[PDB]
Design a protein around this ligand. Structure first.
Ligand SMILES: [Zn+2]
Ligand SMILES: [Zn+2]
Ligand SMILES: [Zn+2]
Ligand SMILES: [Zn+2]
Ligand SMILES: [Zn+2]
Ligand SMILES: [Zn+2]
Ligand SMILES: [Zn+2]
Lengths: 85, 98
C-alpha cells in the first residue's frame, strides 16, 4: 500500500530529466542574457539582468536538488527491494 | 526621435524571445509535475532524511517559479523591443531626404 520499488525508480527518472532540462535552459538563456546585455545601451534591460543574476544560483541549486532526490529515490527503491528479498 | 540603442536586428531579438518563452513554459511544466511528485513521495516517507529534501524543495520552488515568470517577462520585453526597433527604422526612413 506504499510505493513499489518499480514505481520509485520511475519517479526518480522524472526528477533526473527535470534537473537536466532546467540546467540546459539555464545554460542556453545565460548565453542569450550575456549577448543581449552586451549589445544594449542604457538601462532598459538592467532590471531583467539584475533579477536573472539573483535567481540563477537558486535555479542551479534546485536543479542539483532534483538530481539529489533522483539518487536518493534510487537508493531507497534498492533498500525496499533488499528487505523484500 | 529615438531610444537608447540595441545593437541587434529585430529578427534575432524575436528569435531570442522565442527561446525565453519556451524556457518559461518548460520550467513551469517541470515545477508542476515535480510538485505533484513531491506530494506522493511525502505521503510515503515522512522522516528526517527525506525532510531535508522536502524543505529544500519548498524553499526553492517559489524562486524557480519567479524565474519562469521572469523568463516570460523577458520574452515579452524582447518582442516589444523588436517592434520598437522596426518603428524607429520606419520613422528615420520616412523622414529621410533633402
Ligand atoms: Zn543522475
Ligand atoms: Zn531586418
Ligand atoms: Zn547573436
Ligand atoms: Zn508569452
Ligand atoms: Zn508560453
Ligand atoms: Zn504513484
Ligand atoms: Zn525547517
Amino acid at each position: 500500500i506504499k510505493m513499489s520499488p518499480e514505481e520509485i525508480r520511475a519517479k526518480s527518472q522524472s526528477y533526473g530529466q527535470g534537473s537536466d532540462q532546467i540546467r540546459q535552459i539555464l545554460s542556453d538563456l545565460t548565453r542569450a542574457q550575456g549577448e543581449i546585455a552586451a549589445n544594449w545601451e542604457g538601462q532598459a534591460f538592467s532590471r531583467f539582468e539584475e533579477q536573472f543574476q539573483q535567481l540563477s544560483p537558486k535555479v542551479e541549486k534546485f536543479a542539483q536538488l532534483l538530481e539529489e532526490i533522483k539518487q536518493q529515490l534510487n537508493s531507497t527503491a534498492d533498500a525496499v527491494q533488499e528487505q523484500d528479498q
